[PDB]
């Protein structure tokens, strides 16, 4: 009364991604349920929302050298997913273990001078291929820009729209072309009020949109 042994012709590989399971052996063992313990989480993303980050400039000093005089240009960095401006960065490491990624990106700003001091600044996006960085607030504005002041607020969070070629992109960058993937998106300012020595901070973080597809080791394990 055998059932037809519809044997397997060549499948069933002991391989990586698999969802197959196993047999408990010294099994049938409880544990005190670990609910109500603090520090629970699931998402690298979501925990990367409430937590901001920092940045870096060649001066190795995380904060921004913030000259306060007739100068107009502040400083210009880049935002890849992997760039000297953004190595030591809670995103990238989490990022660099991936290839596909999508969605908006976050930033922050923290002021330094005494509140009394009036001020002006201007965040500004630049698309990868304008062929020339802007050199004046209003013509910079043509791409993307906004404002704030010392007045009525000190913090701020900003975002660049997830422009790309396709609705996704490569995490690492290529050694087969030239054009920067994003640009040199950075900040302008109107007349400094007064300061003996300012300073600026800046971060990035996950928000409504920071997403990924996935995954492989790059490193030399």
């Amino acid at each position: 009364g055998i059932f037809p042994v519809a044997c397997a012709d060549g499948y069933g590989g002991l391989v990586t991604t698999d969802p197959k399971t196993a047999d408990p052996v010294y099994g049938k063992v409880y544990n005190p349920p670990k609910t109500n313990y603090p520090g629970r989480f699931t998402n690298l993303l979501d925990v990367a929302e409430a937590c901001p980050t920092f940045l870096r400039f060649d001066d190795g000093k995380p904060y921004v050298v913030t000259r306060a005089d007739d100068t107009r240009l502040l400083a210009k960095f880049d935002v890849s997913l992997a760039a000297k401006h953004m190595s030591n960065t809670y995103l990238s490491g989490i990022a660099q273990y991936y290839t596909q990624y999508s969605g908006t990106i976050n930033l922050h700003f923290m002021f330094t001078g005494s509140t009394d001091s009036k001020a002006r600044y201007m965040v500004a996006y630049i698309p990868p291929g304008v062929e020339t960085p802007p050199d004046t607030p209003e013509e910079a504005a043509h791409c993307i820009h906004a404002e704030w002041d010392t007045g009525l607020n000190s913090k701020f969070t900003f975002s660049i729209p997830y422009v790309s070629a396709a609705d996704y992109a490569y995490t690492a960058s290529d050694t087969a072309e030239t054009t920067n993937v994003q640009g040199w998106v950075c900040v302008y300012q109107i007349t400094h009020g007064k300061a003996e020595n300012d300073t600026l901070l800046v971060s990035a973080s996950a928000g409504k949109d920071f997403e990924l597809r996935l995954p492989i080791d790059p490193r030399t394990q």
Binding site: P52, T53, F54, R56, P62, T89, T112, S154
Partner: peptide, 19 residues
């Protein structure tokens, strides 16, 4: 040194005579 730039994972505040 490198990981310095990561601290704020933990709960925290800011320290500046204004805020």
């Amino acid at each position: 040194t490198r990981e310095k730039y990561q601290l704020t994972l933990f709960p925290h505040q800011f320290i500046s005579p204004r805020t």
